[PDB]
Ligand binder design. Structure first.
Ligand code: ATP
Ligand code: ATP
Ligand code: ATP
Ligand code: ATP
Ligand code: ATP
Ligand code: ATP
Ligand code: CL
Ligand code: CL
Ligand code: CL
Ligand code: MG
Ligand code: MG
Ligand code: MG
Lengths: 268, 246, 268, 246, 268, 246
């Protein structure tokens, strides 16, 4: 039995053994929440902007949950960057900064959660297996905070103390682990451009691109946390992501309906 | 190198392999008596790995088709059980098991209250484990190093059921070919293919380490080797992390 | 007022007083979850066996929750017996072993819970008063871990350090406390036999038996934890249990439909 | 007797009756001053019972028809309130109340940090309480003994509002018939019928005990008797558990 | 932008600055749970009385949740007053008494919660944003404990150590914070009288009164915790409360239907 | 005055303003070195305020229309982040951050284990914050005083980014008119209109205080002033609470 030989390797070898690794790779693949979509609501790009950005997006979430299962994660934003600057100036390590940034994404989940409470949509911990709300047509959505749980065990970047895995990575890994069908990043620009559209006056819009092409074009750290692009190339379930402008009325609704608004980034 | 401060520079971190614990009283009792004698000498954070019971839950979880983020907390549970077992044997000395949140933000006060604490070496990646392999990559060795380096600890010592790192599995098919490595660098190990007694992810986090310059893997089945390693004596395999001394 | 005299005794006597005990015994009897069924899924007998055993039982749970309220508890299995052997060889007491075994039943609840998440069925703590899932037709079931909460306060057996109250007792006591209508143990044999069917070649099947008859026939510690039989004779609400083979397709479904598959064990 | 190891062999466990606490400052203040003087002499785990407020919640819960597993945590709450009250009076000495999980796995570190801790004597049986009686059987005396014996503690002393065990309730209808028992065995008490100042379930868990050989019930309303009992002096009723000394 | 000038004041001034306070007062007003009603079930007046009081009220809650969203908080009662008397006689401060009283309101929520479990109604923490139960027609209600969370940070009264903010204040502040439409106190008298109806033989019933008129008539500390009347005059959302007799069959049902049973107390 | 007992009469409570923390290393590093030298002299409960990040979350929350009970925990989060930052800098001295529940019921044991702990100064009013203002009234100064007075602590010292209380904002429009107040009473401040460096609710809870007779506001940007204030030296503004000495 390949099942038998896998268990022999699992008992007799180190988990570093390539033969064991290869046998585990042949295991079946169960998707835990295959019909859900994970959405990240940007901290700096959306929630920090207040009612003019958040209220229309609340309306879209309420309308969209009628036909789409939603896992809605929150970014952190300007208060996290303030905390990072204080802590970095004290010489504190990335693992300590990681814990501080989590509190800010938590704040944002709380505020969004209180606007959605009367619509039945709760705030849950990380929330993959918040199985009851995502199975009820009256609810069909949850809100969670987007920071990964690594905290003091955050792996640092090659340089600096800014945690490299933030809300983009936290939301993406949730979609990947639960085998969700779709991952949508909600930011404040129409999508990926050839340069930062805020600081370059003739950047060109990019509707569709691969991770390798992004790296080759020199924009590995552009609209998404650059570790997300590497996680995307390793993913088993979520092999592409879409980035859309949450400041455009109805943009999230149209993305959920399958319209190619924004930029689609593919693993290959 | 304009590196971050050391939070707990006086701390010594010891990682006990889960397969050492798997050997039961025959291995645990001498290890407990060696740890008892070390308590007045060092301020110890003792972290336990998972061992064979995690292999069984991997066997069931892989049979059920579960993803790598599902397997990670299932394995972490076995490391915490090993920690509860070890701490129970040291309770009469004032040692208790402490949870990840206590380790992360309240280790200082607890090591002020007592000479050593026991915790789990698995890091809380859980369902945010990285994809790629179906086996969770960030295991006990990796979590113990991430903690030790984040704290700026004086050292990390890895307590194994073999003498150290060999050029092949010394208990495997190519065992008459396996040659002992007294010293190595993390970069040299990472560019090799083949099994190791430590996580391959340990080598990756050593590449970005800020403080820990060397990690020694020693045989915890030989009494005295952990004691010697905590004094800087070379009784196992030294892994150079690539952090340079000032 | 018998209510008045009960409160006099409650104020004036030790709770050991037989007069107080007898007056409390006359109190009314409220059933908290009278229409629920408690099911134990064996650790060693089912979950340890992987997909071939677990996947059909997941299908039966999903189908059965349409017409039956389910509290589904998990056993522990081989990983708990490994932990018991390590701890017992160190001379650790039953109370310490009890805490270790709980983690294993928790693991099993997690795995079963992730297979059921897309069907709306959550993993809850112990879960008697997880009132919302058990009241919704879209859910109507929960998963919990079967270990009792005694931990360090576990009463030891007369000999040895193996905790005498494990997942069988934990699941039974839940059914008894919430006054459930039915308790079904899902194992890997058709039911009770006159001897262990795995180590005796001509054991005879027993469709129905009392606790006293089991004790007299010499099988107090057979297919169920032997303390369960004593708890059964003391129970107020659950006065019989049924043991069925979870490896037989549809066996749990037919037991829920009232078919006398397996063995029925009665308190008297 | 090939019995399990003693986890905390230096520990002394004291159970304070909830009806002692019910007497308020008049009983609590002398008890607190006696406990203060005992802190430098012993390493104390002080556990509180429930008392009269549990009788009231039993009265309401029984009126509502609630099962015994519903009543158990309601009574346990009152024991924990008594513990918070007692710990508040000893806070200036470094004493705090600790929760069941801390008691179960982290008592060692806490008794390394301070000389005594207070906790609840009720065990966490709660909705897994045994059926049979409508009154929860595993109460304060029973939980305190289960803990003390599991730890292998040096002793358990039960602090009562009477001198000890009598042949009848010394405050009840048959009180002129009640005769004091300086010593008894748990088996002799279990085969009697009639009320006791200790749980009947205490006698059952003494039958399976592994370490504790005797438990003394002393009158906490007489200053000095707890102090004397913790030195092994016979000032109350000694209950022989049936564990034999080696 | 008044939004711009508010953020300037928020960055540049102390929060004590009257100019900042006045600009914050002009902010928009979001109601989190505008269609819910908060109900307090008295500890001493109802739950302490057992089945004869509690069982009819359980029936009314089950019937009422069909057309009315309910947040049901519990009082404390005689066991809390016993704890207060013990602690006060030891010289313990109001903050310590506050923690003790909370456990008793928790007990009462537990008992009520177990009578309601089979009807789908859960016990939740404080429970404003327990968004899923309050959005499902099968549930539409939750039970919580009424004590405020101040604990050791309780502000003492001007004299004595009895915590001045108890279950009345805890339930009222929940209704005010979530902007609920209605606050009903369920006690054991028909409403406010000109004197305590239990100790005066010709008190007169008062159907409707303002806070100022209560203070002028000398009954600031009568049927409600007297700090509640001051909180009522400061409230933004709940500007009146109704006090009804829970011992009268159907009285809570009729209050929810808009009938003027009991006493209506207005902020102005 | 038949007042309640003092729970922790040996305790000194220090409140660090969130806007002091906002200044980063330039203010925090000298403050940390002063706190290090104070550890052997006092038993310290160090509580942190919120500062500017709470103003930003108020800006967003007020823009979203959220009520005052929604804003209160959002601000409290920023005080706790400041506490984690400060405790991290003192970890090598045995100092850790402790949560509100630990502060409320287990402060005694923790100050037995180590010389100082850090916590949040915001009180857990959260969604039970009082209505009236759209700005949460019970802030850091208020929570720190409620705790200190409930404990019967030896003092509370408030560490500010200004010398003390002035007759107007010394950084505001009327700043050439602002005159320093070496001493004041809480009642005199409460009957004035205008901004203060302390919560107006602090003045209200001083009116009902049971133990603390004076609170000093000192400039934490001047090294030595916190040290002097903890010895009773007058280096800032003294606020008389109206508790009378016996
Ligand atoms: N090539 C590019 N194309 C588009 N946007 C780019 C590019 N390079 C940089 N950006 C910037 O990336 C920003 C999005 O990242 P940002 O961190 O602001 O998002 P966020 O999800 O709101 O973050 P957080 O949640 O952590 O606050 C855009 O506002 C844009 O200015
Ligand atoms: N190159 C190698 N050098 C040494 N041992 C090796 C090597 N390759 C494989 N091994 C094997 O690794 C075994 C140790 O297994 P493993 O590293 O999984 O244990 P552990 O560290 O106790 O477990 P855990 O990671 O759960 O704490 C050794 O006994 C040896 O057989
Ligand atoms: N007389 C008997 N009739 C039937 N089975 C018996 C008998 N005596 C012993 N057994 C054994 O009892 C076993 C069931 O107990 P077991 O502990 O394996 O169940 P489980 O519920 O899976 O346990 P756990 O959940 O603790 O892992 C059967 O597999 C069978 O071999
Ligand atoms: N045989 C007996 N000997 C002594 N006291 C008895 C006996 N039978 C009944 N009692 C009564 O038991 C009373 C003590 O009550 P109880 O044991 O319930 O108190 P407690 O131990 O303080 O309570 P808790 O169990 O909640 O801690 C004594 O005051 C006495 O009246
Ligand atoms: N003028 C008055 N009119 C009506 N009732 C009054 C008046 N003055 C005092 N009362 C008393 O107020 C009582 C209600 O307050 P009480 O504290 O008993 O309520 P509760 O909500 O049950 O309290 P808790 O929940 O804290 O136990 C009534 O039983 C009544 O006797
Ligand atoms: N009358 C006054 N006297 C002194 N400072 C005043 C006065 N009125 C306003 N202020 C201002 O108050 C500022 C301090 O702000 P604030 O009190 O909000 O800070 P903080 O205490 O650090 O914050 P937090 O309350 O979050 O801990 C001073 O720098 C000063 O400009
Ligand atoms: Cl690996
Ligand atoms: Cl009894
Ligand atoms: Cl103010
Ligand atoms: Mg290894
Ligand atoms: Mg007693
Ligand atoms: Mg200030």
């Amino acid at each position: 039995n390949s099942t038998a030989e896998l268990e022999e390797l699992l008992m007799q070898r180190s988990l570093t053994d390539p033969q064991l690794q290869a046998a585990a790779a042949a295991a079946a693949d169960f998707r835990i929440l295959p019909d859900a979509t994970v959405i990240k609501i940007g901290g700096q790009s959306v929630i920090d902007r207040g009612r003019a950005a958040v209220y229309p997006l609340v309306d879209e979430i309420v309308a969209a949950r009628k036909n789409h299962k939603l896992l809605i994660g929150t970014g952190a934003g300007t208060r996290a960057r303030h905390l990072y600057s204080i802590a970095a100036g004290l010489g504190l390590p990335a693992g300590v900064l990681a814990q501080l940034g989590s509190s800010v994404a938590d704040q944002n989940a709380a505020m969004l959660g209180q606007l959605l409470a009367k619509h039945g949509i709760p705030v849950v911990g990380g929330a993959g297996l918040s199985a009851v709300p995502l199975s009820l047509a009256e609810v069909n959505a949850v809100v969670f905070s987007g920071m990964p749980p690594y905290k003091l065990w955050m792996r640092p970047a090659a340089e600096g103390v800014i945690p490299p895995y933030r809300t983009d990575a936290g939301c993406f890994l949730l979609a990947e682990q639960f085998g969700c069908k779709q991952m949508i990043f909600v930011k404040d620009e129409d999508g990926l451009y050839t340069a930062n559209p805020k600081t370059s006056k003739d950047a060109t819009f990019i509707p569709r691109i691969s991770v390798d092409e992004m790296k080759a074009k020199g924009l590995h750290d552009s609209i998404l946390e650059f570790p997300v692009l590497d996680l995307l190339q390793s993913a088993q379930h979520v092999r592409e992501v879409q980035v859309v402008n949450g400041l455009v009325p109805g943009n999230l609704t149209r993305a959920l309906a399958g319209e190619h608004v924004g930029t689609i980034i593919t693993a290959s | 190198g304009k590196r971050p401060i050391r939070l707990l520079p006086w701390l010594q971190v010891v990682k006990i392999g889960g397969r050492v614990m798997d050997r039961g009283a025959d291995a645990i009792l001498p290890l407990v008596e060696e740890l008892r004698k070390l308590l007045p000498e060092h301020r110890l954070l003792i972290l336990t790995g998972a061992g064979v019971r995690a292999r069984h839950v991997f066997s069931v979880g892989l049979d059920l088709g579960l993803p790598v983020g599902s397997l990670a907390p299932l394995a972490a549970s076995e490391a915490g059980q090993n920690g509860h077992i070890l701490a129970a044997m040291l309770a009469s000395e004032g040692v208790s098991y402490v949870e990840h949140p206590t380790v992360a933000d309240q280790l200082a006060i607890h090591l002020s209250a007592t000479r050593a604490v026991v915790g789990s070496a698995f890091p809380p990646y859980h369902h945010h484990e990285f994809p790629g392999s179906r086996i969770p990559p960030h295991r006990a060795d990796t979590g113990a190093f991430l903690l030790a380096d984040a704290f700026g600890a004086a050292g990390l010592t890895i307590v194994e059921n073999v003498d150290g790192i060999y050029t092949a599995d010394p208990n495997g098919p190519d065992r008459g070919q396996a040659r002992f490595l007294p010293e190595t660098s993390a970069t040299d190990l990472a560019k090799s293919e083949g099994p190791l007694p430590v996580d391959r992810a340990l080598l990756d986090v050593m590449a970005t380490a800020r403080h820990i310059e060397r990690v020694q893997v020693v045989n915890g089945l030989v009494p005295g080797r952990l004691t010697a390693a905590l004094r800087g004596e070379h009784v196992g395999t030294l892994i150079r992390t690539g952090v340079r001394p000032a």
